[PDB]
Design a protein around this ligand. Structure first.
Ligand SMILES: COC(=O)c1ccc2c(ccn2[C@@H]2C[C@H](O)[C@@H](COP(=O)(O)OP(=O)(O)OP(=O)(O)O)O2)c1
Ligand SMILES: [Mg+2]
Ligand SMILES: [Mg+2]
Length: 596
């Protein structure tokens, strides 16, 4: 009931020093070569595919077709996203079987599965290990993007921040050979770093930690400030505020690190016992004072605030921050806009001086991160009016809210979408259910909200732009699915994709219509299912025309048999934007070619 094979490097097994009776010994040439190359040292010019071509002799494949069928999957490994798989299928499907020299002497009909086992050995014992020898993979945290960084430079970088953490006092060796919470990982930021904990998977206390986060979130709700709700706050502020809106958003530097455990333990102790009893109070306090992690092999106590990656860190940081809000941010204009999430504050006032004062107050309380500040304050050199907060983009002048999309230059969009899941596999001969489960609406629901579809503060223009921008993300993940199909499912008839595509267009259009009807306001004019449907169709054509040397069939099918005419009951909404790719999507990389 396992159909997939995952591209992750942990799938690797320890390279045996010579293969045994079961396996053909043709590959021990390559097992020898893995050692002959690992006893090599280089410092700059390295191609991964090229050198693998020399560890594994061409004689294992015998021809030029089987070898490229193998190097497709090694390429996919090189360009992997986290939790991305291939079908075990691809390691035996449509091979030339009597062109290899070494199953020419085995049962003609038993070749598939033991060639599969052989290829499995190749990749698990040589391919992913040679990579893991030359590179570390790191998660960008931008989707499932994995960047490959040569371990030589990364060990150095890890060493420099370990330097900073022991040259400071943030990390003190305890050597109690004490059970550590988990393994410390250093992960690059931009020009910076981030120190994280990977918890040891010991699922005896996971429901306990969940009970605890639950309890103190209930404590947050009843004890601390009901923080309104972002949509409500923005709605009512923009309605009551006639004039030009001034605003600022600031990010607190090292939020988890600058929590003061003294103050935190006090706050924990102050909680009424009917909400958090004495034992769990003491466990939590002991827990946040006593945080041990393993790094290299020496054990270290973490002294710098709450430590990221720990299950209680989010809830305790919000407890601390709500306390700080009560202490320092209680006296601001009740007719002004204020909202916080975690380390991000968003303040707005028609009064410039009041926005200026809020910034001064914040910079007095916390150490802000200047890089991340966004404001139309005249005091700042480069005023913005679009400020990003909570994955939205609030326009201070127009009061419009657009979905914010994190898509850096030359970011491969396929890294946002988790096409495969190991726990629920799908066999190679059912592409329809795979496409379906990829087109399930959760992955885009977060840009289908009142924030996007209200006609209370947002124009009809803006609502429709939000819908089209969501359907672009949707069509992109549809194209990602199709790539997975053509290179793992290796599809025969594409008859199901027309039905899947029609179904998704119509269902997402229906959800959009219902959301828009639900949040009607003073700037509603009229919205139509025909218009929504054709917006979505245009969104799909916009994506598919970047490979219209593939999708010419589908392109022309939808243009021939579908309604795309764009008529609004408004003269305000520019339709030229609903025909091109939006400026945020037209440069995301769609080709999956082995970089380093
Ligand atoms: C590596 O995978 C993970 O498991 C993972 C990623 C991010 C995580 C956790 C746990 C908490 N978070 C982040 C904590 C951070 O504190 C906060 C705000 O993020 P941010 O402002 O961007 O970083 P921070 O303020 O500390 O420092 P900075 O401002 O750059 O100085 O959400 C686990
Ligand atoms: Mg921050
Ligand atoms: Mg932030």
């Amino acid at each position: 009931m396992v159909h997939y094979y995952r591209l992750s490097l942990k799938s690797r097994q320890k390279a045996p020093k010579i293969v045994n009776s079961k396996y053909n010994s043709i590959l021990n040439i390559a097992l020898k070569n893995f050692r002959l190359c690992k006893k090599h040292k280089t410092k700059k010019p390295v191609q991964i595919l090229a050198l693998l071509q020399e560890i594994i002799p061409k004689s294992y494949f015998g021809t030029t077709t089987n070898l490229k069928r193998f190097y497709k999957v090694v390429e996919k490994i090189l360009t992997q996203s986290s939790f991305e798989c291939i079908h075990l299928s691809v390691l035996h499907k449509c091979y030339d079987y009597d062109a290899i020299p070494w199953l020419q002497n085995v049962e003609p009909n038993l070749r598939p599965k033991l060639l599969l086992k052989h290829n499995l050995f190749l990749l698990d014992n040589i391919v992913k290990p040679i990579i893991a020898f030359y590179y570390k993979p790191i998660k960008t945290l931008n989707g499932h993007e994995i960047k490959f960084i040569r371990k030589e430079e990364y060990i150095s970088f890890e060493s420099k921040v370990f330097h900073k953490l022991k040259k400071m006092k943030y990390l003190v060796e305890v050597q109690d050979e004490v059970k550590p919470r988990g393994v410390l990982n250093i992960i690059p930021k931009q020009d910076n770093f981030r120190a994280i904990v990977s918890i040891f998977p010991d699922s005896a206390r996971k429901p306990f930690f969940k009970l605890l986060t639950s309890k103190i979130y209930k404590v947050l709700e009843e004890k601390y400030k009901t923080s309104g709700s972002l949509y409500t706050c923005w709605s009512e502020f923009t309605q009551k505020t006639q004039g030009q809106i001034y605003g600022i958003k600031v990010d607190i530097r090292d939020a988890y690190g600058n929590v003061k455990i003294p103050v935190l333990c006090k706050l924990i102790q102050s909680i009424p016992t009917h909400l958090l009893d004495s034992e769990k109070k003491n466990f939590i306090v002991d827990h946040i004072s006593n945080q041990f992690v393993a790094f290299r092999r020496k054990i270290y106590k973490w002294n710098h605030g709450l430590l990221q990656g720990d299950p209680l860190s989010g809830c305790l940081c919000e407890l601390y921050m709500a306390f700080m809000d009560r202490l320092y941010f209680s006296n601001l204009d009740k007719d002004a806009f204020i909202h916080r999430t975690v380390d991000d504050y968003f303040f707005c006032s028609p009064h410039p001086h009041k926005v200026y004062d809020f910034e001064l107050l914040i910079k007095g309380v916390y150490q802000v991160n200047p890089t991340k500040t966004r404001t139309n304050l005249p005091t700042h050199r480069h005023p913005q009016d679009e400020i990003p907060y909570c994955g939205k983009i609030f326009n201070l002048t127009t009061r419009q809210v657009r979905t914010l999309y994190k898509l850096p230059p030359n970011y491969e969009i396929r890294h946002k979408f988790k096409l495969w899941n190991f726990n629920n596999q799908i066999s190679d001969d059912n592409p329809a259910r795979f496409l379906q489960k990829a087109m399930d609406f959760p992955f885009i629901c977060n840009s289908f909200t009142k924030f996007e579809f209200n006609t209370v503060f947002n124009d009809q223009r803006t609502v429709f732009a939000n819908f089209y921008d969501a359907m672009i993300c949707v069509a992109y993940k549809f194209d990602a699915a199709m790539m997975a199909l053509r290179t793992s499912f290796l599809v025969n008839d594409f008859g199901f994709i027309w039905l899947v595509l029609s179904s998704t267009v119509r269902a997402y259009a229906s959800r959009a219509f219902k959301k828009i009807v639900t949040y009607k306001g003073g700037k509603y004019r009229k919205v139509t299912f025909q218009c929504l449907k054709s917006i979505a169709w245009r969104a799909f054509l916009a994506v598919l025309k970047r490979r219209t040397e593939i999708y010419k069939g589908l392109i022309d099918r939808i243009k021939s048999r579908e309604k795309l005419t764009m008529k609004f009951h408004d003269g305000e909404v520019d339709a030229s934007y609903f025909c091109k790719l939006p400026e945020k999507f037209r440069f995301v990389k769609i080709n999956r070619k082995a970089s380093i």
